[PDB]
């Protein structure tokens, strides 16, 4: 009991990415959705090997009623072949450990949060895989960690199914499953940067690598230089069930911190005969990780900028502005090749703005809200992913730790 943590988040969410163009039959992507998240993790036994449980419970409402029906899906709510949403949707991860040293082993439902395995967080619920997890820090300032996992929880979905990849914007022949995924690599965190290296291999897919590097670095007493580098090697194995896949892709964002203020510029750029790889139900690895589109497209590349305040030390009158934050961020793509359009080129572009306040302090601490808004273009065929869009997510979060 003693280092047990346990967590109950209430989570409202309406999610509206109003479409342009209406692509026939659908005038948006559009849902509204209250859901209850428990998350538990107990410690350990006493013992050489040490022994505990953690779990992950889920139930989500429609607040729409009938009228979801006449959107696109969202991803907030599980969807039916005619396009009904279910009104109700519940389910529950749970999963075993045992620990020796610095050792773990987690056996049953995970959230990987890797560069090759990263569980998405951007709708109601998270992801989960089932599978097996371990984790070293038996040495200091690095971790090892690995995943082998055979199937997938989707986000908005009651049901495990196999792992395997999305089509985004016919990048690939199809969409795939497959039996099985497995990851390893390490973390390894100096003073001012962390370093990763991964493997990753989607059984008859893909392999994957991946390094990268973060850090914030003071460059003075007042002025930090923060850094985030992200870099992809894929290609394709075994029976190939998605054709060719051959893909580098680099990502930066590199900022200035001053006072509260952070400006930042970011650069992506893909090389290679596709685009970029990665498992269903989730965005874009990548470092830009923007809402209306995964910037990640075969020859994409990508030019940003971005703005934020932090108001910790801000007032209106009496009233401090602390828990608030402001972002702002553009991004352009361009020199994207969908393949099948010759020398034929495409381009896409978003202006974000993201409003987000916690209450820091008193009676309700712990509250959250954050209000997201996208303006998003492209030039891309109607047959593709992504749409023109005015997108809206407004958040309303509360979290009760025990
Ligand atoms: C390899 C697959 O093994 C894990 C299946 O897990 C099901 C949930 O298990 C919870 C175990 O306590
Ligand atoms: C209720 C206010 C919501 C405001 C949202 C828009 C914010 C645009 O924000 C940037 C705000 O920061 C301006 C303050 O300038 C201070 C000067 O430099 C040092 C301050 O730490
Ligand atoms: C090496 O990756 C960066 C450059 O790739 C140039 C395009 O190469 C095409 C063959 O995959
Ligand atoms: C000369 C730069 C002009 C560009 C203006 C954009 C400003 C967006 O950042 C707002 C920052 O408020 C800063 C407080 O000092
Ligand atoms: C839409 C334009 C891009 C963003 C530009 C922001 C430029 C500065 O705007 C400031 C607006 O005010 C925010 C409210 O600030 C309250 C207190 O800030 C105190 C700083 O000490
Ligand atoms: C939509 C993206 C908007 C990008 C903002 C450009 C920022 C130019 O910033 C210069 C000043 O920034 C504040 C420095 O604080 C003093
Ligand atoms: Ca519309
Ligand atoms: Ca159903
Ligand atoms: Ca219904
Ligand atoms: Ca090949």
Redesign the pocket.
């Given at each position: 009991i003693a280092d047990s943590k346990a967590e109950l988040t209430l989570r409202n969410f309406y999610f509206d990415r109003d479409y342009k163009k209406d692509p026939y039959p659908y005038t948006a992507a559009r849902d509204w959705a209250q859901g209850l998240i428990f998350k538990g993790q107990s410690g350990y036994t006493e013992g050489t090997v040490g022994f505990g449980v953690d779990v992950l419970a889920m139930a989500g409402f429609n607040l729409m009623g009938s009228r979801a029906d006449d959107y696109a899906r969202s991803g907030l709510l599980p969807v039916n072949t005619d396009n009904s949403r279910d009104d109700y949707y519940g389910k529950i991860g749970i999963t075993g450990k045992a620990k020796f040293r610095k050792n773990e082993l987690f056996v049953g439902d995970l959230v990987p949060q890797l560069p090759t395995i990263f569980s998405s967080p951007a709708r109601l619920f998270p992801q989960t895989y089932r599978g097996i997890r371990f984790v070293s820090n038996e040495i200091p300032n690095l971790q090892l960690e690995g995943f082998y996992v055979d199937e997938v929880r989707q986000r908005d979905s009651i049901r495990y199914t196999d792992v395997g990849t999305d089509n985004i914007n016919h990048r690939f022949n199809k969409a795939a499953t497959t039996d099985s995924f497995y990851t390893l690599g390490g973390s390894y965190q100096l003073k001012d940067y962390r370093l990763r290296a991964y493997h990753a291999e989607l059984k008859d897919i893909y392999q994957q690598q991946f390094l990268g590097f973060n850090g914030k670095q003071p460059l003075n007493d007042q002025l930090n230089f923060l850094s985030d580098v992200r870099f992809f090697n894929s290609e394709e194995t075994g029976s190939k069930k998605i054709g060719e896949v051959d893909n580098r892709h680099i990502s930066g964002l590199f900022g200035l911190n001053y006072q509260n203020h952070t400006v930042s510029l970011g650069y992506m750029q893909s090389f290679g005969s596709t685009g970029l790889p990665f498992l269903s139900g989730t965005e874009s690895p990548v470092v830009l990780d923007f809402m209306s589109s995964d910037y990640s497209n075969k020859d994409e590349k990508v030019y940003s900028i971005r703005?934020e305040?932090d108001?910790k030390?801000?007032?209106?009158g009496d009233v401090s502005?602390n828990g608030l934050r402001?972002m702002?961020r553009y991004a352009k793509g361009e020199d994207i090749d969908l393949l099948q359009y010759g020398d034929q080129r495409f381009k896409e572009d978003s202006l974000e703005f993201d409003l987000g306040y916690k209450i820091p302090e008193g009676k309700l601490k712990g509250l959250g809200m954050r209000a997201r808004f996208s303006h998003y273009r492209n030039d891309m065929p109607t047959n593709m992913t992504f749409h023109s869009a005015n997108e809206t997510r407004l958040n309303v979060d509360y979290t009760f730790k025990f």
């Open positions: 703005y305040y108001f030390n801000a007032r209106i502005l402001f702002t």
